[PDB]
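#help-structures
NK: newbie question, is this the right format to request a structure? protein is T4 lysozyme
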Amino acid sequence: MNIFEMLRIDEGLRLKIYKDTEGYYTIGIGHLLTKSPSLNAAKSELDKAIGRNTNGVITKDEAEKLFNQDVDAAVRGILRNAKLKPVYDSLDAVRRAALANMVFQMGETGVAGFTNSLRMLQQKRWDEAAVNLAKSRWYNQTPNRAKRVITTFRTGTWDAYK
Ligand SMILES: [Cl-]
Ligand SMILES: [Cl-]
């Protein structure tokens, strides 16, 4: 198991523009296109992202390319974030993947806001962090996914994905 497979499980794969859990236009493996309510706007961002006239549809290869880019950007963003980097550096490899999963879903800004949980993770207070992570909009909106990521931080294994 690894960050790629983990996210591929959590995000799924769709070759046509679709709307995410929040109602935003998305494509591939969780690649957010825009928050704009306009499908046209989405179509435009997609073509810009792919480099061609897609007409709202992409191939598997194309989706995978966006995916590789987004994972890289996600991790690199953590390293560039002063509040996240320390946390991430303190963690073991499995747990790093958990943090990166959160960043991928909610943005660096959103995760940096989990101040108290970050502190607990940094202190390796696993059970405590898990409880605090659950007190959030994130957990209430996407509970199954949130549970998977939380268990990963709690146990340090890939069990929830197994
Ligand atoms: Cl892009
Ligand atoms: Cl969910």
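mod (FA): yep, format's fine, and the tokens are attached above. DSSP finds nine helices and three strands in the chain.
NK: thank you!
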